Design a protein around this ligand. Structure first.
Ligand SMILES: Nc1ncnc(=O)[nH]1
Ligand SMILES: Nc1ncnc(=O)[nH]1
Ligand SMILES: [Zn+2]
Ligand SMILES: [Zn+2]
Lengths: 157, 158
């Protein structure tokens, strides 16, 4: 179950990943959405400061800065690509709720290997390995090609 | 590979974890040190003020990228009272910092929390090398095990 509504948000994350790519950054987009449906915060990759400038992390801090603990747990975080261990840990520490992702990090690491790309210094661990009690849906089969192409644009070799 | 020199820094991290506790935070201290032996940055836990991600090992990771060069970062070592959590280990690896030395492991911490009937943290107690495979990791320090058991107990046994 990835709902027709979820898809709407994952597509938006993909738009944001595109946006990041066009500005010279890595293609990752993420979106914070309250239990109501109102979209509270949108972000994308900004590595062109530290290599840690991931949207999913920036949401985690925004979630702590402006929401109450009860709100956070009722929120959902959509993302173009599955949270990396930094981002999943952060999500769990601030006690955010659901995660939905369009491609897995399994998908991504496979494709990097295909392109002979530098295997990242952080392991492509599933979210549930890092944050065991988070509810996780993903990946989305409809967006797999789209993301494969997006990732290729930045990591193909 | 806990050298005498390393211990000096781990004791300093413990002092910092104590400073955090006293001020009403969780007892975690960490210290950034260049090859030269000059201590570039010191920090401790700051989660009371509101944010559960306010870990000193992460704050070093960002300080390391804003203020050093990549070659200096790999050159550097990060000491910590308690083994880096997955957030912090990942951050360390992303910014390409070098060695990590830790006084207690997370295996130690989780085993105590269970000993005290404490709630497990929402993030799993993964070794650093599970998250950041190519980081050089020394720790734990037998001399500081009792000290940290008691410190952790003070916050997480009550
Ligand atoms: N999941 C993830 N890995 C790497 N960079 C990111 O922005 N996100
Ligand atoms: N590693 C770690 N766990 C919890 N709090 C911290 O400041 N650090
Ligand atoms: Zn991440
Ligand atoms: Zn941490």
């Amino acid at each position: 179950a990835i709902s027709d509504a979820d898809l709407k948000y994952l597509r938006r994350c993909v738009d944001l990943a595109r946006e990041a790519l066009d500005d010279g950054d890595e293609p990752f987009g993420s979106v914070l959405v309250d239990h109501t449906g109102t979209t509270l915060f949108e972000d994308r990759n900004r590595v062109k400061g530290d290599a840690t400038a991931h949207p999913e992390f920036a949401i985690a801090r925004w979630a702590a800065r402006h929401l109450t603990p009860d709100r956070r747990a009722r929120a959902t975080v959509y993302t173009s690509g599955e949270h990396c261990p930094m981002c999943a840990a952060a999500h769990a520490w601030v006690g955010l709720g659901r995660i939905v992702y369009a491609t897995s990090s399994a998908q991504l690491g496979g494709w990097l290997t295909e392109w002979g790309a530098q295997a990242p210094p952080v392991a492509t661990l599933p979210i549930n390995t890092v944050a065991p009690g988070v509810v996780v849906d993903g990946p989305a089969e409809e967006l797999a090609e789209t993301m494969h192409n997006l990732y290729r644009a930045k990591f193909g070799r």
